[PDB]
Amino acid sequence: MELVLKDAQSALTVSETTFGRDFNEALVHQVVVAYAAGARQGTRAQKTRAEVTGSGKKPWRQKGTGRARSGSIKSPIWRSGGVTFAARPQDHSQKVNKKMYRGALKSILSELVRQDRLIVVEKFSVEAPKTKLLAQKLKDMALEDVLIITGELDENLFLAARNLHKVDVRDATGIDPVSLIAFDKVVMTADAVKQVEEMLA
Amino acid sequence: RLNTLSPAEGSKKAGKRLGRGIGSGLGKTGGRGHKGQKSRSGGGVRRGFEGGQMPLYRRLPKFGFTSRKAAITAEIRLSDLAKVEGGVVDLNTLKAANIIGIQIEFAKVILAGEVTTPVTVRGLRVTKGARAAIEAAGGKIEE
Amino acid sequence: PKIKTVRGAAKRFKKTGKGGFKHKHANLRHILTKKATKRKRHLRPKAMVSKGDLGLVIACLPYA
Amino acid sequence: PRPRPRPRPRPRPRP
Amino acid sequence: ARVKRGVIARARHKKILKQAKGYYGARSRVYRVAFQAVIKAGQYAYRDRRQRKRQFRQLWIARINAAARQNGISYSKFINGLKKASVEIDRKILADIAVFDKVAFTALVEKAKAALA
RNA sequence: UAGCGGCGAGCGAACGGGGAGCAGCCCAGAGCCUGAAUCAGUGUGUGUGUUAGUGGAAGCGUCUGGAAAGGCGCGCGAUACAGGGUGACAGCCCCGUACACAAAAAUGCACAUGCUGUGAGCUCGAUGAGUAGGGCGGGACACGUGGUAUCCUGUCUGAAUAUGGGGGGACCAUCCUCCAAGGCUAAAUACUCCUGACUGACCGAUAGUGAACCAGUACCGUGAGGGAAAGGCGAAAAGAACCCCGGCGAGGGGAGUGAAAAAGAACCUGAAACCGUGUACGUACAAGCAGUGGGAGCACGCUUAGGCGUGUGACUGCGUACCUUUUGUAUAAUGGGUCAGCGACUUAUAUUCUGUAGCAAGGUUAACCGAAUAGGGGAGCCGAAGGGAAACCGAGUCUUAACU
């Protein structure tokens, strides 16, 4: 298993199961849904018949009147107040096993090299935080919408990719499934591969 | 690529939505039949209720008692006897590999098979069966 | 809130190996002199819970 | 919106 | 996620009122009455799909029995004579034959009379 | 879970472990030494924040369109495409944003430090009496007096005092441990009347706070209190000069503004119930859930020059609404005048089973740490061994003296 670079063709080898396992679609889908579910804020609340600002007085008599039987004006079948099963601020994040999360990331990375979307390079660093020269850089290697992942997160590259919409800079420990899927291409520097190999194992 | 990930077959079931028309098959009291205590909202008998008849947990007599000595007593299988440390085993340091717990005061070594290494047992209570099995591996047993 | 256990059922049923429950026989407390010894002898050991009442004791105690 | 005086009740019997 | 059932409910009622077009009174304007009318009309359509095969068959029988008695033979003897003559022309064609071409029905009557006698 | 409990319903620990945060001191007293740590109250110095704020990048042509930010073409900035407005969707039109700066004066906080109070450090003592405990009656401890330990209290009593006493769950003896009947104490912990910034698989005016519109207002009730309805012209009023009818009215028709007045202030879009006018057909001798199958005639729309489609439909067979409740409803059993909007099996935590994914005799983390839905954390839970009430025994165990 060899990861060939773009220019110097220095042959880097990694573990077999990390970048060559079968693509378990069910395993990936659960983690992707769970990652989206954990980003849900879940800040919402309606009012029940016990929380609507109003009186607990019976509107009219139980019998005698020709009207329907009513006990409170806050009833959900009434106007100006209702909602029987009112929502509460809840948590939508769901638990993911360590081996399931790591197993899904290895299957995601294994499909990336099968779709030749993973481009490994020896180094990735800009001399100045200017976004013009960063936009000059990836255009020469014919990339427009990529995920810039490096082993060491430098502020010189963090500032240059802050304004460009289609690129994102992250730290090697801070990888997630959804950005490895949403972005078209993903680029590796040399030392990030050796750091993501051991964190997945 | 993000719009092609599908779950496996049978992973989802979409739930049962009650009171949603004739065609859904779960309208008109929604799968709980006609009138009765079980049909009311919040209705339902308590656990063990037999309709006023004396329940099984009241027809039968109580028996036995809870011994606090059994709560600080555990059993050691031979599978997790060679896993812990070196070649010697005693009352402590078994909780260091988390096979008994800190509160355990008594322990026994039972015959569960798959014992290879010559472990030396000191202080535990091997029954008859692992005693010949531990000595078959070369390890000695003392107190 | 977790399920609370019916303490009355806990003192009368004990979990067996395969998942069944053992219980003490009734008719063995006070009036023993008028029963035959053969009837009394058969009620001394514990007995299994029948399949008809097996669903009731599961709801009474889910944890034990 | 007011109710109604309700129909005048008849003299109720017994056993 | 609040779902306003405005567009879906209006389109559901419009579909029912579209099928109820042509009905008298509230059976074509009021959704409550029209939905009963459409269901009742659908029940009649399912029911009368069988009666159409009954009413037309007994209509053809009347057509055959009328023309056969003009030739001097009852309907019971005409079908029996045709059956004995190995003729499988059904009552639909036989009713249409007697209406248009009286000459061909006389040959069919004479063919059934020869087989019967 | 152990336990408590008409041992019913139900109530429900502790020990211990893993984490956050960890700060210890003073009096009941004299002497030596006295301001030595210590905090408190007021000034100064420095840092820093708040209450006003400043600078702050980068584009045109052309097409359509009322107007372009929209299409196309060729450029630029970007530590700044966060957001809003601008005649339709703007990174380069503006307000802004990132970033870099700013306080005359008033203060928050952090130290350093001036002054005052405050009391150091050492030795020798002292070491909390109507108190502990007990009797009667209660209360709280998961503990409902039960064999009931422990604490508090209404009343009655009532020691020892550090060679002494309490506790270790009735109680006795031995050991262990601690010291009451005097007090102070930050941190981790709870909440949001209010302020600033930011976010929402929250709502879009019968929803969302009762109140998006000068809403706790109109209004009701003596009073406490209850409590509404009511958003949208247009880009810009440019909101209609002027003429005519009409009561120097209301209202309307012209004209004009306007992209649009089937945008005119009752003003975006204008659904249904309901009420009309016109057109086509049927209908004044024909009985009923008003439909359906067949079906003549009439009026049109068409290519064809044969015939379909639309609308009405004489006549004719069949045909007693829907829901609920019921053995059974056209039932003269219930519900509904209609339309539009709202309206009812949801959520949280546990347990069981199924499907599905990972791992596999192992699986898995909680709290918490953490540049944090990454990684640690195996505290802890389930299974891999069960039998017996239990000691205990163990792939065997219980019963019995032992079991065929």
Measuring CA to CA, which residue among A81, A89, A90 is closest to residue A48? A81
Q: Which residues have a Cβ under 8 Å from the Cβ of B120 and sit 6 or more positions away? A: B87, B88, B89, B139, B140, B141, B142
A174 touches chain D (CB under 8 A): no
Q: Which nucleotide is nearest to B36 (CA to C1')?
A: F325
Q: Which nucleotides of F are covered by protein (CB under 7 A)?
A: 1-5, 7-12, 15-17, 77-82, 199-211, 216, 225-229, 271-274, 289-294, 311-313, 317-318, 321-326, 336-352, 355-359, 361-366, 371-381, 384-396, 399
The 10 Å Cβ neighbour count of residue A169 is 20
Q: D10 in helix, strand or coil? A: coil
Strand partners, B108: B75, B125
Q: What are phi and psi of B126, to 5 degrees?
A: -80, 145
- For residue A148, the surrounding DSSP H or E stretch is strand A146-150
Per DSSP, B102 falls in state T
Report the Cα–Cα distance between both ends of chain E, in Å, rounded. Answer: 85
Nearest CA in chain B to C50: B56
A residues 59-78 closer than 8 Å to D (CB): 60-61, 64-67
Contact state of A25 with B1 under an 8 Å Cβ cutoff = no
Q: Are B84 and B78 in contact (CB under 8 A)?
A: no
Q: Cα(A182)–Cα(A145) distance, rounded to whole angstroms?
A: 10
**Residue entry with tokens 């992250």:** A170
Contact state of B5 with A29 under an 8 Å Cβ cutoff = yes
Measuring CA to CA, which residue among A7, A19, A12 is closest to residue A118? A19
Tokens of E5: 């059932």
Q: Are A168 and A131 in contact (CB under 8 A)?
A: no
- Burial of residue A180 (number of CB atoms within 10 Å: 0-12, 13-18, 19+): buried
**Residue entry with tokens 């947990």:** B57
Q: For the CA atoms of E33, E39, E41, E47, what is the dihedral angle to 10 degrees?
A: -150
Measuring CA to CA, which residue among B70, B54, B66, B63 is closest to residue C46? B63
Q: Cα(B65)–Cα(B56) distance, rounded to whole angstroms?
A: 19
Spell out which chain D residues touch chain A, with contact meaning CB-CB distance below 8 angstroms: 3-4, 6
* Alpha carbon distances (Å) from A167 to A4, A185, E106: 23, 10, 95
The 10 Å Cβ neighbour count of residue C5 is 14
Resolution in A: 2.9
Q: A194 in helix, strand or coil? A: helix
Q: What does R_g of chain C's alpha carbons equal in angstroms?
A: 14
**Sign, CA torsion A166/A172/A173/A175:** positive
Spell out which chain C residues touch chain B, with contact meaning CB-CB distance below 8 angstroms: 6, 8-9, 11-14, 23-26, 28-29, 46, 49, 53, 56-57, 59-60
Strand partners, B73: B106
Q: Cα(B104)–Cα(B91) distance, rounded to whole angstroms?
A: 9
Q: What does R_g of chain A's alpha carbons equal in angstroms?
A: 27
Contact state of C11 with B48 under an 8 Å Cβ cutoff = no
Q: Cα(C48)–Cα(C13) distance, rounded to whole angstroms?
A: 10
- For residue E116, the surrounding DSSP H or E stretch is helix E102-116
| All structural domains of chain A | 2-200 (3.40.1370.10)
Residue A67 distance to chain D (closest CA, Å): 9
Three-state helix/strand/coil letters over C5-58: CCHHHHCCCEECCCCCEEECCCCCCCCHHHCCHHHHHHHCCCEECCHHHHHHHH
Residue D15 distance to chain A (closest CA, Å): 26
Measured in whole angstroms, how far is the alpha carbon of residue A160 from the centre of its chain? 22
Measuring CA to CA, which residue among E80, B63, E11 is closest to residue C25? B63
Contact state of C28 with B56 under an 8 Å Cβ cutoff = no
Q: Cα(B56)–Cα(B38) distance, rounded to whole angstroms?
A: 22
Tokens of B107: 């322990």
Q: Which nucleotide is nearest to C61 (CA to C1')?
A: F351
The structural domains of chain E, with segments of one domain joined by +, span 1-117
Residue A59 distance to chain D (closest CA, Å): 12
Q: Cα(A122)–Cα(A9) distance, rounded to whole angstroms?
A: 9
Q: Cα(A94)–Cα(A99) distance, rounded to whole angstroms?
A: 15
The structural domains of chain C, with segments of one domain joined by +, span 1-64
Q: Cα(A129)–Cα(A155) distance, rounded to whole angstroms?
A: 8
Q: What is chain D's length?
A: 15
Measuring CA to CA, which residue among A182, A35, A165 is closest to residue B3? A182
* Alpha carbon distances (Å) from A170 to A3, A5, A146, A150: 21, 21, 12, 7
* Alpha carbon distances (Å) from C64 to A67, A126, B48: 54, 65, 15
Helices (H), chain A: 16-20, 25-38, 98-114, 131-140, 155-160, 179-182, 190-200
Q: Which residues have a Cβ under 8 Å from the Cβ of C55 and sit 6 or more positions away? A: none
Three-state helix/strand/coil letters over E79-99: HHHHHHCCCCCCHHHHHHHHH
How many CB pairs lie under 8 A apart between chains B and C? 48
Q: What are phi and psi of A12, to 5 degrees?
A: -100, 130
A25 touches chain B (CB under 8 A): yes
Tokens of B28: 């008109």
Per DSSP, B109 falls in state E
How many CB pairs lie under 8 A apart between chains A and B? 21
Measuring CA to CA, which residue among B88, B89, B118, B93 is closest to residue B104? B93
Q: Cα(B56)–Cα(B47) distance, rounded to whole angstroms?
A: 11
Q: Which residues have a Cβ under 8 Å from the Cβ of B143 and sit 6 or more positions away? A: B122, B123
Measuring CA to CA, which residue among C54, C27, C30 is closest to residue C43? C27
B24 is known to lie in a ligand binding site = yes
Q: Are A89 and A42 in contact (CB under 8 A)?
A: yes
Chains that touch A (3 or more CB pairs under 8 A): B, D
Q: Cα(A200)–Cα(A18) distance, rounded to whole angstroms?
A: 7
Tokens of E49: 């799909």
- Is chain C touching chain E, with at least 3 CB–CB pairs below 8 Å? no
B63 touches chain C (CB under 8 A): yes
Q: Are E56 and E90 in contact (CB under 8 A)?
A: no
Strand partners, A121: none
Q: For the CA atoms of A198, B3, B5, B11, what is the dihedral angle to 10 degrees?
A: 130
* Alpha carbon distances (Å) from A177 to A41, A102, A192, B128: 19, 10, 16, 55
Chains that touch B (3 or more CB pairs under 8 A): A, C
Q: Are A177 and A28 in contact (CB under 8 A)?
A: yes
Strand partners, B76: B109
* Alpha carbon distances (Å) from B64 to C11, C13, C14, C23: 8, 10, 10, 10
Measuring CA to CA, which residue among B46, B39, B63 is closest to residue C59? B46
B42 is known to lie in a ligand binding site = yes
**Residue entry with tokens 């098959």:** B25
Helices (H), B9-111: 56-59
Q: Are C6 and C61 in contact (CB under 8 A)?
A: yes
Tokens of C54: 């097996």
**Amino acid identity, position C43:** L
* Alpha carbon distances (Å) from A144 to A133, A165, B105, E89: 14, 10, 67, 80
Q: What is chain A's length?
A: 201
**Sign, CA torsion B10/B12/B18/B20:** negative
